[PDB]
Amino acid sequence: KVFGRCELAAAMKRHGLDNYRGYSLGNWVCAAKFESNFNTQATNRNTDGSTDYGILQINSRWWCNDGRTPGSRNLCNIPCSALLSSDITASVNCAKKIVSDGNGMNAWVAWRNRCKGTDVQAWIRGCR
């Protein structure tokens, strides 16, 4: 599914992301925009053999099992395919564990480079 901007904002808010660990809703929408272009089916292969999955591009090296990343961890205890669903619940729940591990939203490269220190509020402007 390819979400609309305001559609995704409302979905994320319902799942408890607004101000989670101090990060306003605009941050999560901005991250999703530049990680996946609001597409739940986005996948991207990394140089080390791992793969990033879903709306927030979660990595198979640490967080999910895809059966093809030798010596990796499955800290969110899920198959990586569950992160590609039209239902964002699994992506949201795993993201909460990632952002709580000490490094905050710096775990997402696109957030660090394109959202951090910017007017992230603009991403939820006009939405109900």
UniProtKB/Swiss-Prot annotation:
Molecular functions per Gene Ontology: beta-N-acetylglucosaminidase activity; identical protein binding; lysozyme activity
Residues that bind substrate: 101
Gene3D superfamilies given in the database record: 1.10.530.10
Catalytically driven reaction(s): Hydrolysis of (1->4)-beta-linkages between N-acetylmuramic acid and N-acetyl-D-glucosamine residues in a peptidoglycan and between N-acetyl-D-glucosamine residues in chitodextrins
Expressing tissues: In the egg white and polymorphonuclear leukocytes.
Domain C-type lysozyme as annotated: residue spans: 1-128
Active site: 35, 52
Catalytic class of the enzyme: hydrolase
Alphabetical keyword list: Allergen, Antimicrobial, Bacteriolytic enzyme, Disulfide bond, Glycosidase, Hydrolase, Secreted, Signal
Localization of this protein: Secreted
Keyword check for GTP-binding: no
Enzyme Commission (EC) number: 3.2.1.17
GO cellular component: cytoplasm; endoplasmic reticulum; extracellular space
Quaternary organization: Monomer.
Described purpose of this protein according to its UniProt entry: Lysozymes have primarily a bacteriolytic function; those in tissues and body fluids are associated with the monocyte-macrophage system and enhance the activity of immunoagents. Has bacteriolytic activity against M.luteus.
Miscellaneous field: Lysozyme C is capable of both hydrolysis and transglycosylation; it also shows a slight esterase activity. It acts rapidly on both peptide-substituted and unsubstituted peptidoglycan, and slowly on chitin oligosaccharides.
Entry similarity comment: Belongs to the glycosyl hydrolase 22 family.
Name used for this protein in its record: Lysozyme C
Lineage: Eukaryota, Metazoa, Chordata, Craniata, Vertebrata
